[PDB]
Amino acid sequence: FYEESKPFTCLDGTATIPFDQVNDDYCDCKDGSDEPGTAACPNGSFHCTNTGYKPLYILSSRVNDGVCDCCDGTDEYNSGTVCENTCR
Ligand SMILES: [Ca+2]
Ligand SMILES: [Ca+2]
User: Fold this and answer.
1) Terminus of the chain with fewer CB atoms < 10 Å: N or C?
2) CB 37: neighbour CB atoms within 10 A?
3) Where in the cell is it found?
4) 55 CA distance to ligand 1 middle (Å)
5) Residue 77 CA to ligand 1 centre (angstroms)
């Protein structure tokens, strides 16, 4: 009748979790692949999309650290620091 969506598998094959454990602010994958958008994994990376300009990757520990790391300011989305777009 209703088919269920498949779960997420860590890019390193170390675990399979439902997609509600993706970006849930707890590190479930040894490679950090379940938390690309948060500061939860010690070896993760956050992608600065920097729309219109060169994209950059930063350490996950720099997501919501209150410091402006991406020129588009997208790394600071719930920290209290409001970053201005400085890509130009
Ligand atoms: Ca997680
Ligand atoms: Ca930051």
Assistant:
1) N
2) 18
3) Endoplasmic reticulum
4) 24
5) 18
